[PDB]
Amino acid sequence: TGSMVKSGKARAHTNIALIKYWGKADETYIIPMNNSLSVTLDRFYTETKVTFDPDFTEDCLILNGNEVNAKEKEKIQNYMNIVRDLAGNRLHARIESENYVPTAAGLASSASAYAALAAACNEALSLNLSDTDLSRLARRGSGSASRSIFGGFAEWEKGHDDLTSYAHGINSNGWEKDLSMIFVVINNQSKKVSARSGMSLTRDTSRFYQYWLDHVDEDLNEAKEAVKNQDFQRLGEVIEANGLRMHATNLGAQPPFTYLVQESYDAMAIVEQCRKANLPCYFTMDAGPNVKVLVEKKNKQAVMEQFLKVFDESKIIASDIISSGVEIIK
Ligand SMILES: Nc1ncnc2c1ncn2[C@@H]1O[C@H](COP(=O)(O)OP(=O)(O)OP(O)(O)=S)[C@@H](O)[C@H]1O
Numbered sequence: 111t112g113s114m115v116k117s118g119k120a121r122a123h124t125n126i127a128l129i130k131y132w133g134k135a136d137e138t139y140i141i142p143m144n145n146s147l148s149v150t151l152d153r154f155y156t157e158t159k160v161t162f163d164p165d166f167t168e169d170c171l172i173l174n175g176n177e178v179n180a181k182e183k184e185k186i187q188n189y190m191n192i193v194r195d196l197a198g199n200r201l202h203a204r205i206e207s208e209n210y211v212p213t214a215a216g217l218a219s220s221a222s223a224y225a226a227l228a229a230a231c232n233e234a235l236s237l238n239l240s241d242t243d244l245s246r247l248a249r250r251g252s253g254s255a256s257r258s259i260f261g262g263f264a265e266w267e268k269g270h271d272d273l274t275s276y277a278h279g280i281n282s283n284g285w286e287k288d289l290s291m292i293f294v295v296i297n298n299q300s301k302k303v304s305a306r307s308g309m310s311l312t313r314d315t316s317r318f319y320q321y322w323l324d325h326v327d328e329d330l331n332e333a334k335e336a337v338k339n340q341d342f343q344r345l346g347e348v349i350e351a352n353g354l355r356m357h358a359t360n361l362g363a364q365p366p367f368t369y370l371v372q373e374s375y376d377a378m379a380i381v382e383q384c385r386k387a388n389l390p391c392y393f394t395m396d397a398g399p400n401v402k403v404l405v406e407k408k409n410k411q412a413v414m415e416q417f418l419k420v421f422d423e424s425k426i427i428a429s430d431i432i433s434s435g436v437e438i439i440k
């Protein structure tokens with residue numbers, strides 16, 4: 111609000127990978143081993159304001175109304191260095207961010223977080239970045255954030271370097287408007303292996319990683335053709351298989367691990383029962399036990415009702431798919 115003070119605020123929505131990003135070719139720049147395909151969710155998002163002021167001497171992150179720890183403080187300061195290099199300036203920022211994402215329920219916040227921050231910085235400093243360069247900037251903070259620049263279906267092109275690795279939105283003739291995702295919240299323990307660490311151990315040591323690589327391009331192609339034709343069953347079958355293959359890779363790591371628990375398998379079983387009961391739907395899982403169930407909007411209520419026979423109402427949470435991308439807000 112004062113002169114010499116530059117601020118910007120953005121809202122960016124989370125996204126869920128249907129064809130998985132799993133393993134980095136370049137750990138420092140976050141370049142992936144394979145392309146990925148995601149859908150951006152309407153219900154869950156991060157709002158982030160950044161304020162650059164010549165009088166600030168270091169960057170500060172206030173998250174959900176509270177100061178972050180020294181660890182997170184260091185992480186955010188290193189990311190802002192990237193931003194300062196891009197902008198050609200030396201200004202430090204006060205960052206105030208709120209996650210509107212059920213993180214206690216295990217949903218991931220890094221995709222919306224880094225997409226929001228990149229967009230906020232772009233607005234604050236008038237960088238005039240293209241969506242491509244916003245995607246590249248967000249990517250540097252978290253790989254999945256590259257995709258949250260966009261709404262609906264989005265694809266992260268792996269590229270081969272910092273300049274070529276980024277996402278773009280896929281037009282699906284408005285198909286995203288007909289689809290929903292139900293989150294089945296499942297309890298794990300022993301603290302989670304972050305996606306970054308897990309995928310690193312797997313990419314580095316898994317005896318089944320080559321199997322993943324040999325099939326991921328075929329899956330992505332199949333999925334994209336399914337999107338062109340708005341063929342729900344065809345999309346579902348391939349993404350469900352792809353998700354399972356990603357978890358298979360962890361089983362081959364040295365030593366093996368899994369994100370899935372018996373309750374996860376219970377939820378998958380319910381999805382298959384829904385399919386056999388003329389209620390088409392398909393599941394996927396990320397770096398934890400939650401099961402995400404892709405379903406057509408017309409069937410959302412019904413599928414949820416099947417889950418509600420078994421799971422607490424608090425643990426069944428649905429979202430539609432949003433069509434628009436990252437937003438600049440007040
Ligand atoms: N609004 C935010 N602004 C800045 N950083 C955030 C924000 N929200 C979450 N983070 C950071 O996101 C990191 C978490 O990412 P992860 O450990 O990979 O798990 P996650 O929260 O599910 O995000 P993913 O899995 O990577 S999409 C935390 O270290 C936070 O510091």
Ligand SMILES: O=C(O)C[C@@](O)(CF)CCOP(=O)(O)OP(=O)(O)O
Nearest residue numbers: 127130131252253254305306396397
């Ligand atoms: O989102 C997907 O494609 C699949 C996953 O969510 C499944 F676990 C991986 C997310 O990776 P990410 O959180 O980006 O780790 P980072 O790049 O080290 O920050």
